[PDB]
């Protein structure tokens, strides 16, 4: 089959950066009627594909002009002439020249923006959680930057390792920042230690750790 | 405008076949061919073959020969995709898509067909609502947790309080996926508990209101 090679694999750039994505084909995608059937889509978070770029350079319906096609043969490139906070997500060329027909591995365009500290909130477990006889505590850290972060949990000031399940968003489509949830799951232990919940964030945006908690 | 409406069985044992459907509207279905793509969970995009909505003429990407058919309906504008002998490599994202000009690339896609090939049953998720009386912002939230399998479809007031929201992808441990969503709103709302997210988990015919 056709390889279809995407560089680079993540590119991070700047909100009004130029954006630059190379595709290239094991295989001239220049079939032979002539015509080269090269084109772009891009995948947003939680999206279908949307086309971009058919027949090498041609902008598809409703396509900003800052996004151009071009290259020939073997070596196509993807342009974002000033790149928008809407415009992440996964770039992927596909060649319709050679059955069967394929897709390169995509390049995870990502916005660098300038650091942000998250919101923090706690949660004491459901009371209909605890009819059943369960206890989360939740915590929700929100709009961040980098994604990078620690959240530590402590009942009674002592930490928990076992027990929590955290998941990140993906890069929001306008300011550019990450959210995380970070949940611990105890089952009657959350009378046994009732009090002094406490969920602990250390972000680059500052040397003390983010604190909310909670007891009674 | 141009509409692909993508639906079909989301958890399938082991073995087993499915079959997910296509069914088009703002154009003339019989003048042209659909494709399918497979998507795994992250990661990237596959083509399966196409088939002529014309002559019903079909054309397979050869590693999914004997494992995909393509069939379509005329009479209702629905292509059809029967995945036989299903194993978790099946686990994917299946999209078809209009192509508009021949049969070499395609504009429109549906909106994909999550399927899970797993042993494992059904399971309705518990939704638990999330209160703190902090601040004049307030955030509550949603947890769904214990369910099985992907996906489910959260929203806040039926989709009315769309900018200030977070929802957390699932995440799986004991074999079950547990989700979250957050909501924000101004001092002109009640941080009122159980604001109302609404929860569908399809795959357990679960619709709840909490």
């Known amino acids: 089959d056709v390889l279809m090679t995407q560089t680079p694999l993540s590119l991070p750039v700047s909100l009004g950066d130029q954006a630059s994505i190379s595709c290239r084909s094991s295989?001239?995608?220049?079939?032979?009627?002539?015509?080269?059937?090269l084109e772009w889509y891009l995948q947003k978070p939680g999206q279908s594909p949307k086309l971009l770029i058919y027949k090498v350079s041609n902008r598809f319906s409703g396509v900003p002009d800052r996004f151009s096609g071009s290259g020939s043969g073997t070596d196509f490139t993807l342009k974002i002439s000033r790149v928008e906070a809407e415009d992440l997500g996964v770039y992927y060329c596909?060649?319709?020249?050679?059955?069967?027909?394929?897709f390169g591995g995509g390049t995870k365009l990502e916005i660098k923006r300038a650091d942000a500290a998250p919101t923090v909130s706690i949660f004491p477990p459901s009371s209909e959680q605890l009819t059943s006889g369960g206890a989360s505590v939740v915590c929700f850290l929100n709009n961040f930057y980098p994604k990078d972060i620690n959240v530590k949990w402590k009942i009674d000031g002592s930490e928990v390792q076992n027990g929590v399940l955290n998941s990140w968003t993906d890069q929001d489509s306008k300011d550019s920042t990450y959210s995380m949830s970070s949940t611990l799951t105890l089952t009657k232990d959350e009378y046994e230690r009732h009090n002094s919940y406490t969920c602990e964030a250390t972000h680059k945006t500052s040397t003390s750790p983010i604190v909310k908690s909670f007891n009674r | 405008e141009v509409q692909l409406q993508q639906s079909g069985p989301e958890l399938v044992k082991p073995g087993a076949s499915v079959k997910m459907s296509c069914k088009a509207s703002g154009y003339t279905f019989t003048s042209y061919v659909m494709h399918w793509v497979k998507q795994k969970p992250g990661q990237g995009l596959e083509w399966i073959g196409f088939?002529?909505?014309?002559?019903?003429?079909?054309k397979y990407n050869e590693k999914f020969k004997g494992k995909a058919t393509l069939t379509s309906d005329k009479s209702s504008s629905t292509a059809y995709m029967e995945l036989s002998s299903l194993t978790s490599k099946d686990s994917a994202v299946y999209y078809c898509?209009?192509?508009?000009?021949?049969?070499?690339?395609?504009?429109?896609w549906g909106q994909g067909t999550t399927l899970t090939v797993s042993s494992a049953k059904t399971t309705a998720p518990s939704v638990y609502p999330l209160a703190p009386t902090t601040g004049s912002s307030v955030t509550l939230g949603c947890l769904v947790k214990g369910y099985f399998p992907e996906p489910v479809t959260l929203t806040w007031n039926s989709g009315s309080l769309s900018s200030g929201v977070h929802t957390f992808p699932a995440v799986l441990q004991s074999d079950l996926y547990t989700l979250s969503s957050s909501v924000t709103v101004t001092s002109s709302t009640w941080p009122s508990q159980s604001i109302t997210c609404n929860v569908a988990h399809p795959a357990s015919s679960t619709k709840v209101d909490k």
């Open positions: 295989q001239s995608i220049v079939h032979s009627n002539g015509n080269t059937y």
């Open positions: 898509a209009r192509d508009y000009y021949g049969s070499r690339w395609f504009d429109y």
């Open positions: 596909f060649q319709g020249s050679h059955v069967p027909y394929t």
């Open positions: 088939i002529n909505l014309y002559n019903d003429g079909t």
